[model samples]
Target: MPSQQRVKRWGFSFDEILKDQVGRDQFLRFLESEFSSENLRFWLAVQDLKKQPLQDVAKRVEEIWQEFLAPGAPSAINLDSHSYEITSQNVKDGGRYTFEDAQEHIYKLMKSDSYARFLRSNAYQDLLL
Candidate 1:
């Protein structure tokens, strides 16, 4: 199904791009060029958090915060003040879905900003060739 005709489908939707390895890799490359790949990394981390056991959830939640949300985190995401405040409170309370609001914000950011630029970039269009 990777015919030239189908390659253009990768630009159709964010979910469509994420549902396959090829698309994911290309998107990763695009984000890397834009130097905002932490967004995708955080998104993938949250998806992993969703599958952890209850006992593991709390620990994973902490790890995600330290990795992506904590101030001065090595790969911290660009969270806004509002979402950042919500995430900080959730961390204090502790849960698997602590970053829901933050992730949602980032998801919309990616789909509307980065993902749109990616569609226009030769990185994605090159696939059609």
Candidate 2:
């Protein structure tokens, strides 16, 4: 069973849901139903890249780009032109923060749009029970 305190906190803020592994899992499953789990997956990949050693950051960021941001990416995400341009340059620069702008974009998209819908979903309401 999910903790009531943890589950309740998810209603308090978007970050709260992300801060808990349980919440992340629940939210991911919720997103999967919407066929937009790639946004979360991309966000997770960038987060992992930030924690990676220098040698790992390069390869991982490239993989993230190819998977989510590059042309004909397997899991291409919707990025505004501004973020797309900035991320293109950042990826070329090859830093741990390469996807910072894009991550923020997707985070906002999920938090504002997806998260709101998630709160109303039967999945979340069932957890409340």
Candidate 3:
């Protein structure tokens, strides 16, 4: 018997956010707090697969980029160019650092009292979907 292959759903990307910095920042802040360290770690591990050929990364990046740029409801999470580049580089470098490490690197941004309040609000939870 053949094994069943798992289908994958792609996600948001950086270039799309660059076109609208304000909205992008709002979404990114929301995602930064929604998931636990474990979840983010898993995401980082998956993203590490981008370390393949540059062509592959470019294709995947384009697909994700288009998704974020598409019209419809705004995404709850997004990535800016700077953050995307950092993540890509980390993946290319073999992802020696775990998600917790990445979180610590962005700790200042995530630890803001104002952002925490935003994350704790009912409105923010609604945006998670």
Candidate 4:
């Protein structure tokens, strides 16, 4: 006979750490420890979304070659694009907040200086529009 299986669930609050960088870091560490590698990568990919220009990212996305979207055969999607979009939309859609009021509050905590450096770097500039 086959063995039975169980599923587990977890939750978190974004505003719970409002203006608290240390708290946010600790929560991220907790998440890294608790979730799978794929989940962790997804979270990290989108960590700087608010700090970057989303419209610019979206524009770059449209330029991706159809060949780039070919079946899962190792690509930037694994390291960047897919995870970034997932994480960004989750934040934009309020999936990070547990309460309605908390969701409505916009906390733009991302710093743009780092994003500017990233955008200018050879590593990322080619990927953006």
RMSD of each: 24.6, 24.7, 23.8, 20.9
Superposed by TM-score, candidate 4 places the C-alpha of residue 43 at a distance from the truth, in angstroms, of 5.2
* TM-score, cand. 2 vs. native: 0.70
lDDT of 4 by residue, 1-129 (tens): 211221111123455442345554655687658653344333444454435685555433333312133344222334377865764554356443547565344332234346677777989977776
What lDDT score goes with residue 66 in model 1? Answer: 95
TM-score of each: 0.68, 0.70, 0.23, 0.27
Runs of candidate 2 exceeding 4 Å displacement: 95-129
8-91 in candidate 2: lDDT tens per residue? 999899999888888999999999999999999999988888899977877888899999988899998999999999889888
Least lDDT summed over 10 consecutive residues: which range in candidate 1? 1-10
For model 2, what is the error of residue 60's alpha carbon versus the real structure, in angstroms, after optimal superposition?
Answer: 0.9
Per-residue error at 71 for model 1, in Å? Answer: 2.0
Worst 10 residues of 2 by lDDT: 90-99
Judging by TM-score, tell me the better candidate of 2 and 3.
2
Error of 1 at 5 (Å): 4.2
Could you give candidate 3's per-residue lDDT for residues 1-129 as a string of tens digits?
212221111124554443344544544566668652333333443465456675576555544433333334133235587976775565456434557766776786667746888888989998998
Q: How does residue 79 of candidate 4 score in lDDT?
A: 38
State model 3's lDDT.
0.50
Error of 4 at 77 (Å): 12
Backbone clash total for model 2 is 0
> Residues 1-129, candidate 1, lDDT per residue (tens digit)?
366654677878889788877888889999999999999999999998989888898889899999988878999788788999988988887765768899999999999989989988999999989
**In terms of TM-score, which candidate is strongest?**
2
The C-alpha stretches of model 4 lying farther than 4 A from their native spots are: 1-14, 36-47, 59-129
